[PDB]
Design a protein around this ligand. Structure first.
Ligand code: 0KX
Ligand code: MG
Ligand code: MG
Length: 381
DNA sequence: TGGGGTCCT
DNA sequence: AGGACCC
């Protein structure tokens, strides 16, 4: 009933890919920029005071010698991401994707198959690969410790394979569930791995300063818990279950309370092929229908390129826009003939479709100014 | 004024 | 169609 789970997080992913593209940026402090924001930066820049998700002004101010690379086109990063996911799928068929650079792999069955091959005299030769959380002493007779050590061996093999086959470095965390693996992956960064033995579990769960640092607790839930006087992990462990159920609903309360103890009963789910494609474009303002129509033709073009390559045809189109000052969206199924024609000029009809979806949301007669325009193809089959 | 994704309601 | 979460 006890598992072995590994979590893989790539170091400065966008920056890493940009460095692989042209090695001219290997030692220069590098930051990947999308509009007025630096999503990530090279670790050389991270030394200079540059942080992830800084303003471009705050980045160049704290580090003027910073070199910036535009990263609004995610195509190369996406290619690398799925190469990583496939590589990990080689080890175990079930690999769950989180983000572009995070991956969960269930090593349990693989670890057992490994253990049955070893002999009684060899069970003493098992050694850890990478870091052990909190320098915890290993009990070679504790079977859980052994299985987690094998998990660290498989994790090291995974990272070595990633570097030799894709030229990518990453951090890994081996634990007994998903939450603890993802939490223990980032203990030693960059390009280091850490295994967490059960005794140290509580320590890790209290190393956190605030509760938002837990996956599954976002801005809304954390704001509500701040309003409820919950500011620490122990504050959530000790909170009355009934009151929390009443304030957050039944499901969320049970789940985040179980998370508050580091308990994760979730299994690794084979992510497989993506359930949707989408292209985004933001700006300061857009106040012309023809202005919006051209951007929709652009996003529509890139999406048309992407859908014909997957071989899976989308069955529903969605338009999302954000007005100036929240998001709003209107979708509809794609007609039968244009679905079949994908793979014939399919450009002209789709536009009209989206434009209809556009005119429903915004009255062209009344003035308007749009902040965000995004197109999505979903319901792939 | 980031550019994507997931599932639940 | 919107809302919560993740990177
Ligand atoms: N809000 C976000 C978060 C991440 N990303 C992209 C940029 C990152 O290169 C990539 C991975 O994000 P991340 O793992 O949170 N931090 P990154 O991998 O850049 O460096 P580490 O801090 O993991 O070493 O996703 C984004 O575009 N918008
Ligand atoms: Mg990450
Ligand atoms: Mg990362």
């Amino acid at each position: 009933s006890s598992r072995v789970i590994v979590h893989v997080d790539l170091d400065c992913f966008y920056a890493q890919v940009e460095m692989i593209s042209n090695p001219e940026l290997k030692d220069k402090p590098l930051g990947v920029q999308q509009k007025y924001l630096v999503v990530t930066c090279n670790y050389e820049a991270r030394k200079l005071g540059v942080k992830k998700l800084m303003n471009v002004r705050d980045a160049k101010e704290k580090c003027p010698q910073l070199v910036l690379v535009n990263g609004e086109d995610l195509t190369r990063y996406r290619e690398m991401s799925y190469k990583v996911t496939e590589l990990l799928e080689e080890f175990s068929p079930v690999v769950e994707r989180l983000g572009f650079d995070e991956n969960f792999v269930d090593l349990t069955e693989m670890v057992e198959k490994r253990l049955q091959q070893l002999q009684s005299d060899e069970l003493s030769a098992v050694t850890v690969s990478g870091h052990v959380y909190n320098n915890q002493s290993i009990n070679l007779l504790d079977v859980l410790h052994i299985r987690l050590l094998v998990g660290s061996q498989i994790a090291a093999e995974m990272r070595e394979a990633m570097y030799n086959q894709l030229g990518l470095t990453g951090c890994a965390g081996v634990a007994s569930n998903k939450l603890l693996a993802k939490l223990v992956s980032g203990v030693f960064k960059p390009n280091q791995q850490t295994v967490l033995l059960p005794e140290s579990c509580q320590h890790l769960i209290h190393s956190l300063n605030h509760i938002k640092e837990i996956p599954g607790i976002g801005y809304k839930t954390a704001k509500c818990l701040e309003a409820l006087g919950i500011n620490s992990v122990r504050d959530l462990q000790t909170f009355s279950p009934k009151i929390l159920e009443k304030e957050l609903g039944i499901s969320v309360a049970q789940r985040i309370q179980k998370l508050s103890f580091g308990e994760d009963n979730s299994p690794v789910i084979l992510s497989g092929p993506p359930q949707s494609f989408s292209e985004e474009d933001s700006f300061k303002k857009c106040s012309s229908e023809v202005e919006a129509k051209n951007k929709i033709e652009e996003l529509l073009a890139s999406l048309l390129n992407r859908v014909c390559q997957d071989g899976r045809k989308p069955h529903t189109v969605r338009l999302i826009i954000r007005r100036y000052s929240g998001r709003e969206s209107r979708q509809c199924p794609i007609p039968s003939h244009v679905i079949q024609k994908l793979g014939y000029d399919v450009m002209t009809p789709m536009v009209d479709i989206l434009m209809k979806l556009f005119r429903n949301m915004v009255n062209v007669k009344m003035p308007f100014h749009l902040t965000l325009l995004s197109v999505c193809f979903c319901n792939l089959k």
